[PDB]
């Protein structure tokens, strides 16, 4: 009963932390080595972040250097960057992947803001799914006679109260991000 809630709560903060990380890849200014922290390729049957397959170094404020450990992996790596939501286009000199963020742009801003809201809604779907699963377990508890109806009643309210707390955290994260990309 309490266990169902603790667990749900635990699963929900993890969802919030995914939102947080996801949102942090949305540039608002200049480069970052974690702008690419979410980018993966198929590496011998496994979804592998490109940060495991390349040194990720920032020389300028605007430039990142991606240096594949395996020259043969460069193109796959490069292709994953281009297919990403980063809306940037990398180059290469055969051994090193250079990527300069565009000067921003007001058209670009609007897209970023839109990306921000979307990533929040994805994170909300996940949080809501966690609620549903936990609610199913409270419905079972009640059916099997494992706790009294009042107790299960209170837990359903607590579950929804908690869910709302994490959805709201997500709203604040999205809120901060749009702020940042309108001023910053």
**Do 137 and 51 sit in the same domain of this protein?**
no
Its domain, for residue 176, covers 1-29+105-184
Structure tokens at 71: 């020259």
- Which domain-ending residue is among 71, 104, 137? 104
Q: Is the dihedral of CA 178, 179, 180, 183 positive or negative?
A: positive
Distance CA 153, CA 158 (A): 9
**Do 99 and 130 sit in the same domain of this protein?**
no
Q: Count CB neighbours of 59 within 10 A.
A: 10
**Do 48 and 116 sit in the same domain of this protein?**
no
Which technique? X-ray
**Do 17 and 65 sit in the same domain of this protein?**
no
Q: What is the resolution of this structure in A?
A: 2.2
**Do 45 and 111 sit in the same domain of this protein?**
no
**Do 158 and 121 sit in the same domain of this protein?**
yes
3-state secondary structure the chain: CHHHHHHHHHHHHHHHHHHHHHHHCCCCCCCCHHHHCCCEEEECCEEEECCCCEEEECCCCCEEEEEECCHHHHHHHHHHHHHCCCCCCCEECCCCEEEECCCCCHHHHHHHHHHHHHHHHHHHHHHHHHHHHHHHHHHHHHHCCCCCHHHHHHHHHHHHHHHHHHHHHHHHHHHHHHHHHHHC
**Do 45 and 97 sit in the same domain of this protein?**
yes
The total of structural domains in the chain comes to 2
């Amino acid at each position: 009963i309490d266990e169902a809630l603790f667990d749900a709560e635990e699963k929900m903060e993890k969802a919030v932390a995914v939102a947080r990380d996801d949102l942090s890849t949305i540039r608002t200014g200049a480069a970052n080595p974690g702008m690419f922290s979410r980018i993966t390729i198929d590496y011998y049957g496994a979804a592998t972040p490109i940060t495991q397959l390349a040194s990720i170094n920032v020389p300028e404020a605007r430039l990142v250097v991606i240096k594949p450990y395996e020259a043969n992996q460069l193109r796959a790596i490069e292709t994953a960057i281009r297919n990403s939501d980063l809306g940037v286009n990398p180059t290469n000199d055969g051994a090193l992947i250079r990527v300069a963020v565009p000067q921003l742009t007001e058209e670009r801003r609007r897209e970023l803001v839109k990306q921000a809201k979307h990533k929040g809604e994805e994170a909300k779907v996940s949080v809501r799914n966690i609620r549903r699963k936990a609610m199913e377990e409270l419905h079972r508890i009640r059916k099997e006679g494992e706790a009294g109806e009042d107790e299960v009643g209170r837990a359903e309210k607590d579950l929804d109260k908690t869910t709302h707390q994490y959805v709201t955290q997500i709203d604040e994260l999205v809120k901060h991000k749009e702020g940042e990309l309108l001023e910053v």
